[PDB]
Design a protein around this ligand. Structure first.
Ligand code: HEM
Ligand SMILES: CC1(C)[C@@H]2CC[C@@]1(C)C(=O)C2
Ligand SMILES: [K+]
Length: 404
């Protein structure tokens, strides 16, 4: 708890801690939605994590993500020193300047590249699921959620699988620090890892993601080694944490909900619609922006330099955006969310994520149609810049499964 700044009023203080929320034991999204109770203002100030604003409603979150003249991406993380050290590209930049770099990032993770990776993403998911199928049980986080997305990103990036444990450790410190590393120390470690590779790939350009970034042009002039490093690093973080945690949330839910399992087994063409409704319900990111000047937003005076968390998770959980928001409805008519962000920084890896998510649902449900949480397990969630699931022990009877 940091001492309250002169310009912030007493009645908007809502001491929420985003790395360790109060009702976390009930589920991390539920823990965040305490911010949407009837008794909580649209925009509150928490004194936790150095102090910062928290917009709690989707109307405010979208407007702040659209207004980059006031809410800048230059310091997008909380606590302030992580936000200051944060210099990844394209995310730490605002438009107009941001735009050249994003186009280049889009060339290595976009839709055309999801199309090239189609065969491998399918192969690997079938493969891992087939391997687990006869055991009748798995540790989902470790046995699928991590290895499926991660090995596809290491593949794209042309990096050896033996590097996963180091890299995933650093990525987790940047999003759910355990205390052992500052955001800045984690980031430097990641750049240290990428420096030589970028240089090798500048000499002998290849087909992999690092080569493509590193030998790229940003609106016609050559990227520097420095800028390639700051783009590559973002890419690794993006490919090593969000899909991984997202898959666990979705599989935890299906494990507790036989009727939803039955719906996709009966009607698999509903899987894309169900993925979007799961991305709404089990949204997991929350980063934010910094004020470029004094500004009055929805009746609250914001001070130049003030940080504001704009939880991308909160927009589709808001009852004002979706009726009965904690309810999963695959037939939901207008699935509204900001799970993949909003404004000029819209997730560039969202096509790759949706493909991994849909392939996982289809291929898991095809081979292991029936499965549940292990008896006696209480699933724990974790909060931070990206929220996630600590471990997910699943069981099933092999006699009900099929090799495909
Ligand atoms: C469920 C999975 C994912 C979710 C929920 C998600 C969400 C987001 C969000 C909320 C942002 C914007 C943050 C901000 O405005 O500060 C973002 C940006 C971005 N994401 Fe994702 N993401 C996911 C997967 C991925 C993947 C798999 C990649 C591939 C490496 C990726 C790469 C990026 C990049 C490069 C940006 C930066 C866009 C810019 O700053 O212009 N993401 N993502
Ligand atoms: C908030 C994010 C998901 C988005 C991509 C990776 C991430 C952690 C950032 O650093 C940008
Ligand atoms: K910064």
């Amino acid at each position: 708890l940091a001492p309250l700044p002169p310009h912030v009023p007493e009645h908007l203080v809502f001491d929420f801690d985003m790395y360790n929320p109060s009702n976390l034991s009930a589920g991390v999204q539920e823990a965040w939605a305490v911010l949407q109770e009837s008794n909580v203002p649209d925009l509150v100030w928490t004194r936790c994590n150095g102090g910062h604003w928290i917009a709690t409603r989707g109307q405010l979150i979208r407007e702040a993500y659209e207004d980059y003249r006031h809410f800048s991406s230059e310091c997008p993380f909380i606590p302030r020193e992580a936000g200051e050290a944060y210099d990844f590209i394209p995310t730490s930049m605002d438009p107009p300047e941001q735009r050249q770099f994003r186009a280049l990032a889009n060339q290595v993770v976009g839709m055309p590249v999801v199309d090239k990776l189609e065969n491998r993403i399918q192969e690997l998911a079938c493969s891992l699921i087939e391997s687990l199928r006869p055991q009748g049980q798995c540790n989902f986080t470790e046995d699928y959620a991590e290895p499926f997305p991660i090995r596809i990103f290491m593949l794209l990036a042309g990096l050896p699988e033996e590097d996963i444990p180091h890299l995933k450790y650093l990525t987790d410190q940047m999003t759910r620090p355990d205390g052992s590393m500052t955001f800045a120390e984690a980031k430097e470690a990641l750049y240290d890892y990428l420096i030589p590779i970028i240089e090798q790939r500048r000499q002998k350009p290849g087909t992999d993601a690092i080569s493509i970034v590193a030998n790229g042009q940003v609106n016609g002039r050559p990227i520097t080694s420095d800028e390639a490093k700051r783009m590559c690093g973002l890419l690794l973080v993006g490919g090593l944490d969000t899909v991984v945690n997202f898959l666990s949330f979705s599989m935890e839910f299906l494990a507790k909900s036989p009727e939803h399992r039955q719906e996709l087994i009966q009607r698999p063409e509903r899987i894309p619609a169900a993925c979007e409704e799961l991305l709404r319900r089990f949204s997991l990111v929350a980063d934010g922006r910094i004020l470029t000047s004094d500004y009055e937003f929805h009746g609250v005076q914001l001070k130049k330099g003030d940080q504001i968390l704009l939880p991308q998770m909160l927009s589709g959980l808001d009852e004002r955006e979706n009726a009965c928001p904690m309810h999963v409805d695959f037939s939901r008519q207008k699935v509204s969310h900001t799970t993949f962000g909003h404004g000029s920084h819209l997730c560039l890896g969202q096509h790759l994520a949706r493909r991994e998510i849909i392939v996982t649902l289809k291929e898991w449900l095809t081979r292991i149609p029936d499965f549940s949480i292990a008896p006696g397990a209480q699933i724990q969630h974790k909060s931070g810049i990206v929220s996630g699931v600590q471990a997910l022990p699943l069981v099933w009877d092999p006699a009900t499964t099929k090799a495909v």
